[PDB]
Assembly symmetry: D2
Homo-oligomer: 250 residues x 4
């Protein structure tokens, strides 16, 4: 049984195409489904409001491109691009993209990273969250405010202020445990190790869970959780942290 | 980690299937690991006009993929290249490379058309039998292109499936039977699939056993050519003669 | 880089040869080392004191068999067989087996499941532990007393009382979360989901960690941790629970 | 889940390497998953006497593995079986099966000796070239055994390595060169390794490409024969002609 996964990714993004396949490859050790990966790109090189807004404009084209392949699920990878567009935009985006696929004769469940993160946090039953991002400070503020608007408290948060998206990919994930250690996490229900999909975090997730004893999620992890759930499949993925423990089928 | 870029028709699913499968197999025999990154050019129906329009979008795709500083790029659609005119695989690869260089990330560009020709030559094969999924006029162009490159063509078959997604649904286990119904004794190598879109991977060894001749597909040729472009050994289990390790 | 793993297993044991390769297969997704697996068998069909004592007598033969292959590490799989022989026997067994390999011209690091479990608990810094076993009650008592003797408190423990070793293999690991739920685990530092190496538990480990928010280990997990550490290799294994999070190189 | 039992000489490491590798490759093309379980019979030096003593321990191994209710058993050592006398692969398999039945767990028993002969026959090969790692007198016995089974032997080579663990250290990439120095034109198939202990897996496709003849090893034969004993399809990528899917 083969599942075709479609990914709408920023052109300069390399991490979504690394971590989502890594996770699902691990899942193949544990469950019979096999996965193939199919991408469409929307141009962005620098994570600024202007580039984000322009990139999102290519959204429809990308969904047309991937529904031409009759992909079984489609994930819009960039969390901040969705949240940058204003409150509740993750719903707008998902519904519009679904319509685009439906009118291309291949209705597909649509996941956005932004929506997946919110849904994953709710599935965990987490009420308060700590958040690490790689974004410039204003963008990070928007994200935190978006999460708060969705009824999820935000405690400590950190912004690495790296706008060059290729430089974001170059950030050492082994720095992340020390960053999280220097944040308050005792008053938090879950830790968002990366709100961004470009910043690698997968290889630090289990370490951080061990160190903090809190559930750790990332935009990438939440997205795969949401894709799996949208396909009515078990969500147990080795190395994917608490959300992918197998205990959560929300 | 090696970053592989894939420029694919929107309806193409088999390049993103067989190339990862091959490279995953390679990870078992060699230390390199691969990640895969795609950009799409829209096309549902494989006609002369649509192929030309889609190729016009090639450049955007190379731009998008070089934003991610990919280590190689493979252009999936064989017939698109061969449809544009004689020798076009060279012109395309050059123009696409220039795009990546102007985007501050010059990268080697492989077309499945060029890869098949180079693969055939690497095999030392002078004469070839070919299976395609294309409509008859288009496979006439493909055969003529191959012949223009100094490679003789014996028996060839066209499945005449213009619906590109439908091409990927063709059962690879049909391919040995198709080949068995063709003359292959006057041939040095068998092109089991001239199209990356038509799956053939699981049929390659069977056909090699049945015919006792080296068998290649556009998909294994592309894999071979991308590996060679990165100066990497080309031993891949289950990839047939071209990926023997021998070359 | 290939690592030859040797396993001394009860003849009727199937789970050690399932979970240790499963774990190390997952590790191959994350680290460059590749593993091959080589077993020697010591006969046992029923987990009784008499069968355990007889089985342990074949110990030297098994170590000779595996050192003929110049295995890079050697694990004695059966936890209860070691503990059944009296306090401190895990040290005796490891040193004797090492000597056997050394005199067979292939000195090998030796791990026992029993010793690995104790070392893994200490590596976690866990002081008090809850324990599930499949053994008959007297044998379970010995194990708990062995752990206590090693300076590790035992709170709640459960014994499934299944002595047919093939029946132990047939125990549904999805029963384990409910068993652990009906034990007190708030006053415990870590949960031993299986003290036995025959009872499957790997596929329930991450679920139980999510449900309890405590580190979960098994004899199988502790053994692979100990084998990896003995080979000076990182201990990050996807799906292997807290001990294999990558945070513990004791 | 399919439970595979392996009866191996203590110093044998390659059966537990190539059989898992092959079956892992199969998991990519077929739904079955495999676990591996071994029992050992002591032996360091491959001599007539030691082979006989080690074979005397076969029964214990079958007993130990049937305690775990394994779905098949493969006896690794080809020369041990062929050394005991003509037709011994049948006697051994039968005696070992009876052991498992008396242990309330009757299981199909494959010997690498029987598997190679059955594999050669399944290929339709009448005449064969053979490479062995054994000392000359022992490979004389092996060749004579094969000839007694109705399979002609052309060119054969003996590497004369009596240290069994050392056999596994022989570079498989030496094998194409060894074969290239042998006559293979008067042969229907090539036994690239008559010993499971001598690795050959990574050389199979290369030799098939170089010689244009089906290539089998005792290790792929054993894998083929165990799969057939469980009525499972025998398509395994990278396993050469016998594991083509064709048979």
């Amino acid at each position: 049984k083969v599942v075709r996964v479609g990914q709408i990714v920023p052109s300069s993004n390399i991490t979504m195409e690394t971590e989502i396949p890594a996770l699902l490859k691990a899942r193949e050790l544990v469950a019979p489904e096999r996965f193939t990966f199919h991408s469409s790109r929307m141009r962005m090189k620098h994570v600024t409001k202007e580039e984000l807004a322009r990139m999102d404009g290519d959204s429809d084209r990308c969904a047309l491109e991937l529904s031409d392949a009759r992909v079984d699920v489609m994930g819009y990878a960039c969390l901040v691009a969705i949240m940058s567009m204003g409150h509740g935009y993750h719903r707008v985006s998902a519904e519009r993209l679904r319509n685009v696929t439906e009118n291309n004769d291949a209705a597909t469940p649509i996941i956005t990273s932004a929506g997946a993160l919110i849904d994953g946090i709710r599935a965990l039953g987490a009420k308060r969250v700590a958040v690490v991002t790689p974004y410039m400070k204003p963008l990070t503020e928007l994200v935190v405010d978006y999460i708060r608007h969705e009824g999820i408290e935000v405690g400590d948060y950190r912004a690495l202020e790296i706008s060059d998206n290729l430089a974001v990919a170059a950030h050492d994930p082994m720095n992340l445990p020390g960053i999280i250690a220097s944040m308050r996490t005792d008053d938090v229900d879950a830790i968002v190790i990366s709100a961004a999909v470009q910043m690698p975090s997968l290889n630090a997730i289990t370490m951080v869970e061990a160190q903090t004893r809190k559930p750790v999620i990332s935009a990438a992890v939440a997205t795969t959780w949401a894709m799996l759930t949208a396909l009515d499949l078990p969500t147990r993925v080795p190395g994917g942290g608490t959300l992918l423990s197998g205990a959560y089928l929300e």
